[PDB]
Amino acid sequence: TLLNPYFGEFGGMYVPQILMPALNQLEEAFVRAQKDPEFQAQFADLLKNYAGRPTALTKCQNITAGTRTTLYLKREDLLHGGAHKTNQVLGQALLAKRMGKSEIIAETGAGQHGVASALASALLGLKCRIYMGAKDVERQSPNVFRMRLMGAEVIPVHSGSATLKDACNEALRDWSGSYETAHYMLGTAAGPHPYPTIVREFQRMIGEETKAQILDKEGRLPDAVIACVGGGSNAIGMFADFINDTSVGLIGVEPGGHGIETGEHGAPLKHGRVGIYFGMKAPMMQTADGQIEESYSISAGLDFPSVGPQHAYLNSIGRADYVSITDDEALEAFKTLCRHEGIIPALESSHALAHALKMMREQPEKEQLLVVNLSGRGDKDIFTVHD
Amino acid sequence: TLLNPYFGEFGGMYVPQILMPALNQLEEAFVRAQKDPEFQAQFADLLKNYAGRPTALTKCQNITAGTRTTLYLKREDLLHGGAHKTNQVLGQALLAKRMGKSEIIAETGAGQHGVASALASALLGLKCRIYMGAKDVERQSPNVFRMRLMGAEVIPVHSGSATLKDACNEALRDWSGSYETAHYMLGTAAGPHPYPTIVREFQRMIGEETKAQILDKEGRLPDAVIACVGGGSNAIGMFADFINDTSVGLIGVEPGGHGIETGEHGAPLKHGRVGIYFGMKAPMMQTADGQIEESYSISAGLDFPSVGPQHAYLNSIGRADYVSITDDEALEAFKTLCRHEGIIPALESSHALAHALKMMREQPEKEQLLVVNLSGRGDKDIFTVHD
Amino acid sequence: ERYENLFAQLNDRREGAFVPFVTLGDPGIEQSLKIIDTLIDAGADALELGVPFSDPLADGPTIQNANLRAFAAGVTPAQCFEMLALIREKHPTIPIGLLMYANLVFNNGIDAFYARCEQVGVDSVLVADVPVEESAPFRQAALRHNIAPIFICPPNADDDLLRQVASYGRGYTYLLSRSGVTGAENRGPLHHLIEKLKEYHAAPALQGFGISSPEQVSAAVRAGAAGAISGSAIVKIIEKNLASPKQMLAELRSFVSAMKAASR
Amino acid sequence: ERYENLFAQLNDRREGAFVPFVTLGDPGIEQSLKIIDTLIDAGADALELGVPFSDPLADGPTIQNANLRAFAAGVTPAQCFEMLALIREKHPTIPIGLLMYANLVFNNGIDAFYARCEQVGVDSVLVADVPVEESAPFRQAALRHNIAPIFICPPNADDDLLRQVASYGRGYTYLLSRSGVTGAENRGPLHHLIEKLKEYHAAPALQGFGISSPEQVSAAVRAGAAGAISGSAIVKIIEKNLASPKQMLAELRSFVSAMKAASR
Numbered sequence A, B: 001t002l003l004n005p006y007f008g009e010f011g012g013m014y015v016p017q018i019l020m021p022a023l024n025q026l027e028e029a030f031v032r033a034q035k036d037p038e039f040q041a042q043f044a045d046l047l048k049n050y051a052g053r054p055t056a057l058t059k060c061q062n063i064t065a066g067t068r069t070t071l072y073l074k075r076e077d078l079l080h081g082g083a084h085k086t087n088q089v090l091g092q093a094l095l096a097k098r099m100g101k102s103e104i105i106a107e108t109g110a111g112q113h114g115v116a117s118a119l120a121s122a123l124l125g126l127k128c129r130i131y132m133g134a135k136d137v138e139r140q141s142p143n144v145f146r147m148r149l150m151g152a153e154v155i156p157v158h159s160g161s162a163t164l165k166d167a168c169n170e171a172l173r174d175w176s177g178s179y180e181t182a183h184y185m186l187g188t189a190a191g192p193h194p195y196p197t198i199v200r201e202f203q204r205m206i207g208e209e210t211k212a213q214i215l216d217k218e219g220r221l222p223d224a225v226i227a228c229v230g231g232g233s234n235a236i237g238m239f240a241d242f243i244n245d246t247s248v249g250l251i252g253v254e255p256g257g258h259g260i261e262t263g264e265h266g267a268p269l270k271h272g273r274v275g276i277y278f279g280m281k282a283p284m285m286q287t288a289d290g291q292i293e294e295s296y297s298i299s300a301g302l303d304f305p306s307v308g309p310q311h312a313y314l315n316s317i318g319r320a321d322y323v324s325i326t327d328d329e330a331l332e333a334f335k336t337l338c339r340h341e342g343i344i345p346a347l348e349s350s351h352a353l354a355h356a357l358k359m360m361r362e363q364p365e366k367e368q369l370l371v372v373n374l375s376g377r378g379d380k381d382i383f384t385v386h387d
Numbered sequence C, D: 001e002r003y004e005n006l007f008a009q010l011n012d013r014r015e016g017a018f019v020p021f022v023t024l025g026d027p028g029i030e031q032s033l034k035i036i037d038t039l040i041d042a043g044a045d046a047l048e049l050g051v052p053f054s055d056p057l058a059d060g061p062t063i064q065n066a067n068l069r070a071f072a073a074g075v076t077p078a079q080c081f082e083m084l085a086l087i088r089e090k091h092p093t094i095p096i097g098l099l100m101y102a103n104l105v106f107n108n109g110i111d112a113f114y115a116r117c118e119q120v121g122v123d124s125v126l127v128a129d130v131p132v133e134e135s136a137p138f139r140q141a142a143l144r145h146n147i148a149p150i151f152i153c154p155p156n157a158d159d160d161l162l163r164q165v166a167s168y169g170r171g172y173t174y175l176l177s178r179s180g181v182t183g184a185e186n187r188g189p190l191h192h193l194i195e196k197l198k199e200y201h202a203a204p205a206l207q208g209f210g211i212s213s214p215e216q217v218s219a220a221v222r223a224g225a226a227g228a229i230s231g232s233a234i235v236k237i238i239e240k241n242l243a244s245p246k247q248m249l250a251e252l253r254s255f256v257s258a259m260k261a262a263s264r
């Protein structure tokens, strides 16, 4: 390979031999693209004139009143599509085109990655195929419909537990026979190299914009940046540009579900066991015999049963820290932002907000300059919180 | 008054004597605010760092392929809240505060104005009261819930036809007894002066941004700017800065419903009769005896049974032109943008898109530089188009 | 000059005027004509009559329902003017005032609306949604057809307004007791306005809004006003007795006799 | 050296090897042990056995259901190794190869997994999701415990890869007939790969993927391969006869006898 496939002990390229040339092809196209000012200018135009880049950095004055904390929110909820996922798909779609590909394969759980892949393919003229577990299809009628309205083919996977895991299986199965014409648009900063590296790089702009933004308004870098972790893409997007700034804390939040102690959660990085699956060596939701298990959360979007290899690495060396937040704790932060700031956050992002809220509430007299990444919009979750 | 309350023959101040001092107070606070750089800087900060201003101007290359038309869309769907309505409410909320008011009264039909008023009041610490016809409350559970989540009081009006009209009645009834502490946050560029003038001015930035934007990218002003008209605010917001540019066409689109000929529509400006109601002299949906009537459309948001006085004026002198678009025609444009551009438009905005699509399709060889105002997001309408 | 004569006669008797309000055609045309006759027979000095409108934005719940009940019986504006003509054919001297919303008078042409009032015998017209700033065409039209244009003097009136109201109006001056909308639900010091209005030679004042008890009309008179208007309290008796027409009229009689006695 | 002996014997007979595949514990432990014995009795030369995994990402519908049926009977990996031990206690010379997914071998420690295979009498191990680029620890562990590490040679292999596969593997070389996943549903020119593999002194080749008919195994042999593997065609007979165990075995016999005869 041209680049290192591992982040310490984690990562790799655990796929059947038949798919290895497809991964080498991708790697090389990415290295070239990054050195091409023509590609860079094109990616920047789409981001700016189509997606709404740069996004605002909003100071939340009401929520922090009475304490010594200053909190800002990176407005990824204002991005076209209502989530950060859009940045990534535009870049990956241009890479597929640079490679001569005309077809896109995609996987999705709650529907967000699927909606994003479908919009990017419609804009850039690519034929889109999307895999979704039958249990999720039943549960996500609005998103399935949005996908079809955008011209994408939606295919229910009835195998296994019929959820994300099983859709991830079907996508690779398909790609192993179609790689010559189709590109697999993986949805998070995980899977086999070069995906964790590519997804990071096409999500870098979140933290890069945040630095210039906080420097302009506060004339100082933050004490910490906080982000939720389903698979790891919005978090690494925020962390990246700050990795070399040793004084800036990096905090990732995993779903705690009904409580870690009940065994009903979605936190593999901190409460799982390292395994090998989905072309990767990383912490995973697994049984005692090594059978792959499902992730649980009130938010459907934090259900990838594993985590990005770069996070498992940043954690081991002590560069970043990871914690968890329960269903009730996320519901509380959701309720509070609606009421005091006029912003409806996704239940996914509410996990990150909830931890920043704890940091404040637990030590109100501590001087703290905080940045939370609001990865998405919460209109999606209105009926869930309602019932 | 300090300013002229009429636009030719239209407009005025048709309210009970008891409310006249409240209108004079408002007028004066607005004139002062506009001359105060401190107010201007504050309004600009909220717009930029909270709402997401400026919005993009997107070129739609796929949709116009094979013709001689170049089409751009003003991305108001990317504004916080998913609609243009937000610009207005932030400005009106600052005016209420400048006036010493602590309470906000608001009216709403489909829920959009209500959601916008509620978010602005939560952000700026004002107590919000919202009136909604009982028939609309039943029909709009998601928005009613969003409003309540934002801390607003929602009050069903069971009088009359129990729709927008009747909510508009209740709001003024309330204000006539509470004007001393409460400000009425009217939702469109209509009603008694100074509301049509104030709403225009706090929506001006849409067209102002569009000019600099098209000048930068095309080095020329457009041949025409197109916008839908429910009550008139997004349209006048777009038109304003171009009024003095005689070479730029101004086109407004009213809902045609099942067909003008069936009498089931929402186009009073072109197919109604001038009357006096809601503190205004303007074209209106009315019976033969002068009883006020309901507006009909597939889109719930284009149901204000009258139209802004400035539009009725621009129409009479020939400065702007107005047309109508049917339910099926709007559904078609909605379907087409999803499929070819990856953007889900509101059914409201789809009326404007549909007319630009006609302009193209009817004369594909005509060289035309067009701008459509995409006033909002269409995630809202997924189940309607579905059934 | 119906109002002028009534006021001279009442002053002669050192009496105040009791003016009840009802919506034409509530609960039906026939029962309404009957309601009005009972009102006069029991002692009303003048009449304030509303024609059913779809959006009465200056009225509270009780009157909102009066309009709703009339709409249910199909009562139209043309039917109303027919009723008005018959009411005058029966009672030649009682002053009659219409409570109107703007669209119903503009609809068919402002001038023609006032020509119809004259034809029928109407004495005055108060348009709820037209302030003095917008009164010119309605004012001019009324005067041209010998109809008195009624103006509202709010409790928060400045000298410029008092001077205006005194100069333009005729018949009577509608002195608002309160801020808000109609409703006997909420009760409503006006000595200064009454004296200033008297100073500018305005038309005799009639207090309206919230008047529902005898003590309230005697207080209006004591303050210097020429009378009092009562609506929701009247309309509530109709609402209460819909199933028993005979009981409705009998109850209407007792209430207006008591109210009239208090103006003495 | 189970494979080495088999191949020398087959070459001696100018015969190709017929190797059927089944998932351990499908449809039950007892019927599975019975299925395997019928397979051997009817003429299988070697065995390819999969242990039930939750996410078999290199397998098509037929084998996906084989895993599902085994999960329904509660079959665990520990139960599988128990079955494996009993199978060897009954048949001392037949080569036995396991088809494994990575997590099941890493789970408990890569080294200990290969120690267990030795203990039970397993001959080879093919890990479906580990390419040569990632094979070091699995390769080293297998050799240390006298287990042959199987490598996959794809139809799109370059000289560097062929050289690698030839150098690292043992037992047999898995020559893929096609691109894609397992499935008798889709049928799959390999003369060049076979000769290049022979040139680099690689382990004898066994063709896999899409083999479901006799003509297909005779063609594999004619091309230069030492044998052929068939899975979905075998598993489909189990699926078809779930309600009749006696009929299942009888049908399994007819199919493998016919397939074995074609390798001659």
Ligand SMILES: O=P(O)(O)/C=C/CCSc1ccccc1O
Pocket (backbone or CB within 6 Å): C021, C048, C058, C059, C063, C099, C126, C128, C181, C182, C183, C184, C208, C209, C210, C211, C229, C230, C231, C232, C233
């Ligand atoms: O029910 P009330 O007694 O409180 C008031 C009755 C007034 C009838 S006339 C009137 C006058 C002005 C605005 C609206 C009206 O309906």
Ligand SMILES: O=P(O)(O)/C=C/CCSc1ccccc1O
Pocket (backbone or CB within 6 Å): D021, D048, D058, D059, D063, D099, D126, D128, D181, D182, D183, D184, D208, D209, D210, D211, D229, D230, D231, D232, D233
């Ligand atoms: O059903 P087939 O005959 O088409 C192929 C059977 C192969 C069994 S071994 C095997 C080898 C590689 C990857 C997955 C597998 O399951």
Ligand SMILES: *Cc1c(COP(=O)(O)O)cnc(C)c1O
Pocket (backbone or CB within 6 Å): A083, A084, A085, A112, A113, A187, A188, A189, A228, A229, A230, A231, A232, A233, A234, A235, A301, A302, A346, A348, A349, A375, A376, A377
């Ligand atoms: C898609 C989704 C996620 C899960 O995220 P990763 O960044 O890849 O971990 C989180 N937040 C939102 C709003 C999402 O839509």
Ligand SMILES: *Cc1c(COP(=O)(O)O)cnc(C)c1O
Pocket (backbone or CB within 6 Å): B083, B084, B085, B112, B113, B187, B188, B189, B228, B229, B230, B231, B232, B233, B234, B235, B301, B302, B346, B348, B349, B375, B376, B377
């Ligand atoms: C609120 C609403 C309208 C109706 O608009 P006016 O601009 O005031 O005429 C139109 N479009 C959208 C998206 C709306 O939400």
Ligand code: NA
Pocket (backbone or CB within 6 Å): A229, A230, A231, A266, A268, A295, A302, A303, A304, A305, A306, A307
């Ligand atoms: Na996860």
Ligand code: NA
Pocket (backbone or CB within 6 Å): B229, B230, B231, B266, B268, B295, B302, B303, B304, B305, B306, B307
């Ligand atoms: Na309208």
